[PDB]
């Protein structure tokens, strides 16, 4: 099976910040740069 | 939204009339939320410049960008002339509408913190 | 595969509040429609407001009048609550004269009637006069949109006239909500509820119709390239 | 940002508002041009979003 | 008050365009730009690969003799294929590719089809080694949004492989608001829309379709109940 990222899948970086995907947004809903580039992942600053 | 902004551009500076303080703010001498004294009372430009008749007017000014939620202004609410920020007034409306009782919600919150 | 046209349901009580629901909508179109309408509703609906006040024997806004409980600021605050509707489309600016003697509780109805000028809230309280107090006012009402602070327009008809913040917008508050809804096997659909508060000069339905028409007119501007 | 200048675009109105709040938070130096203040935010790893 | 704003169009080929709408009242830079950007990024119809059949291949988890890339990588390359339908009534086309090694098969190696144009002929598809052959039947459909293969599940043949379809022809949308002035008022908005597309649909066409979608949605606030 070819598994795509879905809600409930666990993501983590190398610094111990881990979490499950709780929401998958369409591209037009994501925060974007003034040049129009949307971000890919939104992390809560309260985890730092 | 409930914390109020504090400025230091013209803090501690004294004027003689409320119009003089507003004129200094136009030239950039004093900031909007800088603590100042008009005659003998500690106030700020925002409290004098922006006197809103109701929370709706204060939040309409926020929607139009005249003031931020954290700027201290004058708002007439509950029949009282409050020297508060629109965000603190906005928090009061959140409680008032959630409990569907404006007078009880007023007694439930601490507005000035 | 295109979605069926949504149903526009209205829940309007009185002349100052109304709820409007549009469903079902494609994913993200509740936000796509709600935000532009809210920005137009709060800044573009034509309305009237008090932009200048003249009171006899008053020099500055931060003073008081001997013979009335309310100081100048409180009356100015009460005047910003005044809702007036012009009955003549060509009419642009009127002045309302108020001459009351104490002991009286001055209301909005005490203003002198002007042709093609209607006071929507004649029960609005203006000032409370004690015996011996004379109150003379000449308030200037303009036509405009949105919110204009007194300093950013500075309109004075005569000397000693006090500019007042102009609440031109008849809409008092806009709150729109987007909820997840479904139609059969489709689950990412949007349900948009628009709640509009108005001062009563226009209906919340009329405010929505004007806001939609304004957005429609701006969409026609993307024509005739260069 | 230099690519933006060549394309014929200045500073966004929205960026100006954020820069105005940024100096109230002490994040940018008051009195500098919007380009310089945007660079100051960029050196802190922050952008107008 | 303000008259009709002047609409200026600047296009760089078929893939990039700039659209300037000035002067505008305060706040209509965002009021117009963002709804169009959301519609441009989400609801603009286009074409995408929905199914691929390769001879002697049963599923996408296999390799082809004489072919360097596995079927997963070939499908990934096919997801970047940009196909422009010159006929508005064309809804489905099948592209045939027959290649023999040694060659680097590109998007230009598909057989020509009437009213069908490949916008990126230099797109690399597979690397053929000597003795390797690639006989593919790539189906291109017309649609909107992002439809994963698990949803549509289109298979024209028994061993056809459904492909996740990204139909949106719009790659990136940015809009810019400048401080323009007219007369004695200086709080006016200058709105500039920047649209990047894949070339099958031009930025001007995408903008017109986005405006029509918003205009149609505005008619839904009629017939109150
Ligand atoms: Mg004022
Ligand atoms: Mg594509």
XYZ file of C-alpha atoms in Angstrom, chain D residues 4 7-15 17, chain E residues 30 175-179 187-189 192 194:
22
model
C 10.835 42.215 -5.707
C 10.033 43.209 -10.710
C 8.655 46.713 -10.099
C 7.116 46.278 -6.651
C 7.700 48.381 -3.556
C 6.569 47.750 0.023
C 3.117 46.293 0.640
C 0.545 48.304 2.557
C 0.074 45.191 4.693
C 3.816 45.016 5.368
C 1.104 47.880 9.042
C -7.429 42.769 0.041
C -1.408 39.982 -4.972
C 0.220 43.281 -4.059
C -1.265 46.463 -2.570
C 0.570 49.752 -3.121
C 0.001 53.255 -1.748
C -5.216 56.273 1.212
C -6.108 54.552 -2.070
C -5.158 50.992 -2.999
C -1.626 43.943 -8.616
C 0.470 37.945 -9.987
